[PDB]
Amino acid sequence: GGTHIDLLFHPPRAHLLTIKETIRKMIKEARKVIALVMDIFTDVDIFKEIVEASTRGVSVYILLDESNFNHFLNMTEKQGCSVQRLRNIRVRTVKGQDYFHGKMEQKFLLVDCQKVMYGSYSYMWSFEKAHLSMVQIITGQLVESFDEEFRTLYARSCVPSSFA
Amino acid sequence: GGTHIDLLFHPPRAHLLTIKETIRKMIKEARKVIALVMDIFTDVDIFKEIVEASTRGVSVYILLDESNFNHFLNMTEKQGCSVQRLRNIRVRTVKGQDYFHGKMEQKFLLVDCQKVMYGSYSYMWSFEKAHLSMVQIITGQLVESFDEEFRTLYARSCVPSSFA
Numbered sequence: 001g002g003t004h005i006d007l008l009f010h011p012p013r014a015h016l017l018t019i020k021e022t023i024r025k026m027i028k029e030a031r032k033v034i035a036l037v038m039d040i041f042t043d044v045d046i047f048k049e050i051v052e053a054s055t056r057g058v059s060v061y062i063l064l065d066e067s068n069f070n071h072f073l074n075m076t077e078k079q080g081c082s083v084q085r086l087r088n089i090r091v092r093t094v095k096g097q098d099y100f101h102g103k104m105e106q107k108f109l110l111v112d113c114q115k116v117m118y119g120s121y122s123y124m125w126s127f128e129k130a131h132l133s134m135v136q137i138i139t140g141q142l143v144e145s146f147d148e149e150f151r152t153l154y155a156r157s158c159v160p161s162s163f164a
Numbered sequence: 165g166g167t168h169i170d171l172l173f174h175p176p177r178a179h180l181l182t183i184k185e186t187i188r189k190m191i192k193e194a195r196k197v198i199a200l201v202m203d204i205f206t207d208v209d210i211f212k213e214i215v216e217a218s219t220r221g222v223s224v225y226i227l228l229d230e231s232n233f234n235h236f237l238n239m240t241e242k243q244g245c246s247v248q249r250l251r252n253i254r255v256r257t258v259k260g261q262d263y264f265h266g267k268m269e270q271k272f273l274l275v276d277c278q279k280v281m282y283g284s285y286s287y288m289w290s291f292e293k294a295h296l297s298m299v300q301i302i303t304g305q306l307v308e309s310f311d312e313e314f315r316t317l318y319a320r321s322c323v324p325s326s327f328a
């Protein structure tokens with residue numbers, strides 16, 4: 001009942017896949033659940049993979065930082081893919097304490113209660129093309145702590161204003 | 165030769181110290197080296213702890229995202245604590261590929277090649293007062309990978325424009 005961690009980098013260092021490819025593979029291989037916490041979500045390829053998972057019957061829960069939520073909504077609209085009407089996906093927002101918006105500065109992807117990607121990669125074109133980042137691929141016991149954190153966040157999340 | 169990971173949260177969840185307190189304790193207990201990678205560094209209390217470590221003889225290496233470096237410089241000036249003249253501290257900047265600045269979106273604190281804090285907490289007042297975040301405290305074998313990443317980043321870092 002241990003934990004295993006591999007590191008991945010952007011740009012890649014001593015591994016065959018990029019972080020984006022690894023994200024898409026994790027989502028592609030999802031069998032049951034995807035739980036995503038993300039600060040900014042505008043990457044169309046990743047969104048497509050998630051939409052496709054939900055059509056296979058995977059339950060998708062997404063928590064987005066409230067202050068950047070409009071960027072995700074804009075992307076979903078551009079793609080003609082209204083997220084409210086997709087039945088296997090629920091999207092809710094999370095914020096911090098305001099003073100200037102307090103933000104949810106956490107991100108991670110958890111698939112099938114089995115594997116977590118945790119790190120500094122945000123789901124935006126800029127992270128594929130411009131920024132340096134790193135993530136961990138986590139399996140084993142520590143995944144349970146990410147499950148618990150997701151549940152904690154989900155409990156403090158709100159329905160986005162737009163959804164009625 | 166395993167790895168141990170504890171999670172900490174802001175706000176705290178089932179641990180006695182905040183992330184900021186844990187940062188200050190790690191720096192206070194540093195005996196040999198501090199290697200810091202940080203996107204934005206404006207927290208004066210953390211800066212003071214680092215300056216104090218360097219006066220005990222701890223070697224301090226700091227890598228900052230180039231595009232936000234001026235915020236650190238402003239803070240060091242406000243504190244009357246010119247970083248160029250402090251002999252045990254070297255500060256260098258890192259950037260990504262531009263298109264809008266490409267950024268170093270990585271952060272971590274490594275102390276004494278023994279302990280790493282890795283997560284989403286940036287050294288700014290907003291992370292103490294406004295934002296939700298989480299970090300890992302990592303000890304054991306995985307610390308060596310953070311040592312290697314620090315060295316990799318340091319190799320691609322530049323002297324800040326201001327320093328002459």
Ligand SMILES: Cc1nnc(Nc2cccc(F)c2)s1
Pocket residue numbers: 033035061110113146147148150151154155
């Ligand atoms: C990892 C996972 N975290 N919980 C899972 N599912 C779930 C069910 C109800 C509410 C909620 F927020 C999440 S699977």
Ligand SMILES: Cc1nnc(Nc2cccc(F)c2)s1
Pocket residue numbers: 197199225274277310311312314315318319
């Ligand atoms: C963890 C640590 N990472 N390397 C350490 N020291 C060091 C020495 C020369 C250049 C440099 F970038 C770093 S200690």
